[model samples]
Target chain A: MSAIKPDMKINLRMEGNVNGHHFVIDGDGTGKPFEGKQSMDLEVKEGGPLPFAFDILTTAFNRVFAEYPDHIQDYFKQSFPKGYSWERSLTFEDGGICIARNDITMEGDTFYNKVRFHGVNFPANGPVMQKKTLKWEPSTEKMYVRDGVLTGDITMALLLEGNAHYRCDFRTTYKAKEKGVKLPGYHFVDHCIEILSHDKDYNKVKLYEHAVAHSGLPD
Target chain B: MSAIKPDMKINLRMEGNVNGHHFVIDGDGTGKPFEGKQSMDLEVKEGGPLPFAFDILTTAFNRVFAEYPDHIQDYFKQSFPKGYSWERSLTFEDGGICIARNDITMEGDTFYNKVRFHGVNFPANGPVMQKKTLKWEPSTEKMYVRDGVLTGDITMALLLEGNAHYRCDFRTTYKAKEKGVKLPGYHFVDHCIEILSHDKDYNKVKLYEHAVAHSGLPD
Candidate 1:
């Protein structure tokens, strides 16, 4: 009910909904700063956590294992079923503990990506979490522009636990401004939040396309 | 209302619901024998038409493209957004047609496999299709012995053109019988109706893991 005393022991377990995906976090938030570990199981209903990561994974698997014999492919399929899974290691220092893993499986008709919590920092739990509605806000955005069709990189942050946050690096652009992107000539544009990566120090990865142009890459 | 007159020269277009996912089909389906073509567009909300394929793709892509810089990866996402699309070329001679390709972008949501209707000689359409519930029935589907399980790859012919049958190859297997799939030890076993690749031709692929005894694989 108060600041999690460094040595306070607690294990919170339950299931709830986030962005329509079913996630279950199990771990100790009652530890002192820089301590503890939690387990999170996420239903892999969509793509991987990192932007465009899922499509990249599936496309690769489908192709890589495409030619392999059936049994070997079976090996692949068995390993990651249309089911629930465990992913990641949420290592912490002066914060609570969290697990960084995600798995897929079914619960009746629903396909879930039981997410592993990034519960290692401060806590954005219960009322804090449900109410936070945190968003990844971009601050310093950089881009290369040639006659309006532009390209660039952006730095953004995603809040994980309490005040502690997850780092997200975005390789983004406004594509419709480009050629084939809008055809005949570049047209409308939306912030194509292309490639992005957020991690807990180790799982470093994110992806996206670069700035494109209608008049072609300038002379 | 009657068998297509081969020269009916009609192209019907409309939208409706299937398994909750909305879809649209646009093209020609009035044919006889095995001579016709059609275009189908379906929504790609989660995985493939069968299952777990989405995760399989992402997992592989994430690892393979793991090293590729994030920007380059964005190219991948824009190519296949959170959507589905399709085109068709049934390449028929007699009296049947099928779907050909699919692509995607969002909103009301469309799923198009460009469905490859089961064109050859058989069609669950006409009387056969409307009549056959086509079930993938497996009897005494045995495994190494345990009690966690799965089975089915039915002849469920879906209509792409006003009751004309489209082909579907369900390379399905019930994994309920597979061992440790529900383990005290990976003792149970079930059919992972797999190796499926159902298009205009036949190559059914479906797979799942066995209730595996992993400790054994380590040493």
Candidate 2:
């Protein structure tokens, strides 16, 4: 099968102001513009989105039987195809006014996001439209923030050794005044500011240190 | 220098409608879509649009002087550099359109659309922006729409090539007929369709023949 080989990288820096009242302002004074930067090094690849389809029935069954408890399965099944899966292995982390969660699916894909404070969960069994598929395995890690600094790496991968390699590395920083204090100014008014940068390098050794320094959290 | 290699080549087949009327009435009476399959091949190369400062200025000067009288040299210099040069070439065959021509300047990158048509010429200088440069070069063969068929080849070069490796190919096809010399129910509309079922190895040669067969004066 003809496929695109991934080998591109991107470096980006975004800094703006978070008002004392917790309103996030980007460089353009809009909420945020530098959401993500993607660099691609691929050959014989489709440059844009492609058609895709998914089977939601099996996904619904798996979520009810394997993800949720017996008592909760009925409620989840009642919600049917749109139900949310609650699994012990699934983890999420708080980042000041924002939060992030990570999960993997049977289809060899990683699902992750840095959501707003009052954001909703992903709809169950819904297929996603992606520009291109990456060839990296599925994995995810969340980061915590405190006192205007970020503290970890949010990395995810899907299909590591496959024909389509995919990997994403994201680091976030905040402008908080305290470690765990949800200041009155920092409520859930505006959305979270996320800078997601991705490449196929898988250079975790260097990224770990970089994440530690940028995600201002205590070791 | 880091450069991206060309990935896939695209071919667009353009058909001109008489008096700019391309759409046809469908069997159901709702306008039948004018599926004009204009074809032009484009290779995605590994470089960005060339920066336009000294090189563009020199090119513009030469072009303008070649068209002007010998005594107008002093007037040309006084009027030149009044605007900055901002121009880039795109795959006209790929639906590439100029979206932000007003925001272009000599110092920044501009966005474009992905549609292709003929007889569209961008202004060389204006108050809203300045001067513009494009790497598009027309074929020496005069383009004409004989009968209902529009046939012509356009040559274009990647600006990064700096005058080397210029490529010329055709964007040829016929015009869709709205009303012909027959009864209302019996009139035929010659709509262009893509014959993608043919094998790729033979498509190139076949497409070239298709252009020739569809062109020429009506018998």
Candidate 3:
């Protein structure tokens, strides 16, 4: 087995609003109405190369596409069929996150924005519609047998109601063994959205009450 | 834009000892040691294409790799490095679930075995190990969308103890567009050996408990 080392540590954050529900596209919160302000921080791990880190992340993006079928369709319909090819033209800021700017253009319609989540943390819990922040901290990491397979972990925190915050951490690892490859282990959390909602109806409340009242009603 | 149809539904289950910790590996009292016999049932939404159902599932295996970084590492370490390439070589059974077979090979070491699971319902637990059984059902599903992203809820049950499972699920509008090529969807569960064990005290439970309880307690 090959001795492994840390490749990189990244931190990123984005503030924006929801756009079309048909596609989970985030527009810049600016006047453009289809874009958001996203930032990132990437620290190369000791003894590892920068390309290794970049390769792992790119692999993570492609992996997520492979696992979710519907997301694949959404991505194709929104970005590809429309002729919005992904570009490598990104901007790097001193003492700040590097930004990758790309445009999704099709026919006469064009959507321009910058992708700045190279290595950042995602905060959990903030005002539903207000601006929020996310942070990622390096923890444990790994290196694969292939030169291309690099992986690592980041503990994340989310700002929530009040000045206080809610925190839950996730460990992410990526492997770019192949181009256009989707390896497993690419996951993300939508910090500002309530993926699960409970309506304030009498029946719903009663169900909860009954569950609390009787621990083992059926199962 | 393509008029995408809804996803199919499936059910999964297992019997015997499927301790998450050891089911996917080779050992005694673990998952059926190489040639273990397992069965599952899959149900899709009425009137959908049966062959397409398998396509959806195969595609999901690739999709999970795309969405999460951690899974990417696991996939490379568990599936690739050794050379067990993806193969669509199983026959479909009655309930829309397709049966497939593959082995986990790494650096010339190979362990031949059979794998089974469903495409519609996501697994409720984490990775599988030796001698453990897992079950997943799609009837009790809930769907939600945020900022144009679609997600689904899946409940999982692990049939064995001393094991933990991890999984992720996603959804999207058919016309939303996506990145990369489309993958197939089918129902199948994989069986493999858990080669590494992190727990130091494999035989002494109390020693393990004491280590966990006091190692990071107060310093």
Model 3, residue A81: C-alpha shift (Å): 29
Worst 10 residues of 3 chain B by lDDT: B204-213
lDDT of 1 by residue, A1-219 (tens): 121222323232333222122333332222121121112221233322322112112100010011122212111123222322222221122121222223334333222333332221122232222333133332433434423332333344444436755453333222231133211222211122222433532123232221221122242
Return the TM-scores of chain A for each candidate in numbered order.
Answer: 0.23, 0.20, 0.22
Top model number, lDDT: 1
lDDT of 2: 0.19
TM-score of chain B of each: 0.20, 0.20, 0.21
Superior by lDDT: candidate 2 or candidate 3: 3
Give the TM-scores of the predictions, in the order they appear.
Answer: 0.22, 0.17, 0.22
What would the per-residue lDDT of candidate 3 be over residues B24-91, giving only the tens digit for each residue?
A: 11111111111222122222222222222121232222111111122112221223332232222111
CA-based DockQ, model 1: 0.01
* TM-score of the second chain, cand. 3: 0.21
Q: Estimate every model's Cα lDDT from 0 to 1.
A: 0.24, 0.19, 0.21
Model 1, residue B33: displacement in angstroms?
42
Ranking by lDDT: 1, 3, 2
- Per-model DockQ: 0.01, 0.01, 0.01
DockQ metric, candidate 2: 0.01
Error at B41, model 3, angstroms: 22
